[PDB]
Ligand binder design. Sequence first.
Ligand SMILES: C[C@@H](O)C(=O)/N=C\c1ccccn1
Ligand SMILES: [Zn+2]
Ligand SMILES: [Zn+2]
Ligand SMILES: [Zn+2]
Ligand SMILES: [Zn+2]
Lengths: 72, 69
Amino acid sequence: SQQTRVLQEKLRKLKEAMLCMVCCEEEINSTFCPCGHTVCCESCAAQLQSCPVCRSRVEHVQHVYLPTHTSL
Amino acid sequence: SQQTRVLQEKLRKLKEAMLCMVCCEEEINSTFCPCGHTVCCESCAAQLQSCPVCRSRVEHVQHVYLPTH
Ligand SMILES: C[C@@H](O)C(=O)/N=C\c1ccccn1
Ligand SMILES: [Zn+2]
Ligand SMILES: [Zn+2]
Ligand SMILES: [Zn+2]
Ligand SMILES: [Zn+2]
């Protein structure tokens, strides 16, 4: 039905929100400290000197283990 | 259809996985440092000495801003 298409869109947007905002290919699993923005995979986070959301300097990157994480 | 029911179930399980493991009522927004387990809301994380997942000592709690919030 049309409702199947609406639910597919909600699921797609929720899954896209869990993907790295820089590469769009890997799951988010890293936090920029101290600002706390959690928007990148570990490979993109290692290459950024400032946060891509708020431009605060990245003092260090904290790996995060989230219950939503998935793998092959 | 049955497909609508399958998608509703996937959405519900994904949303439940974003809720605090201690109170089950608020969204997860805090990380235990240095282990990195991100399983609690701020109020539940504030009072724990050890991580509820791995038992590592909690040196501090980092607030996290997630795009799914
Ligand atoms: C565009 C995206 O794939 C990407 O940026 N990849 C690596 C990188 C390089 C510089 C900064 C952050 N990430
Ligand atoms: Zn990335
Ligand atoms: Zn930031
Ligand atoms: Zn809680
Ligand atoms: Zn832990």
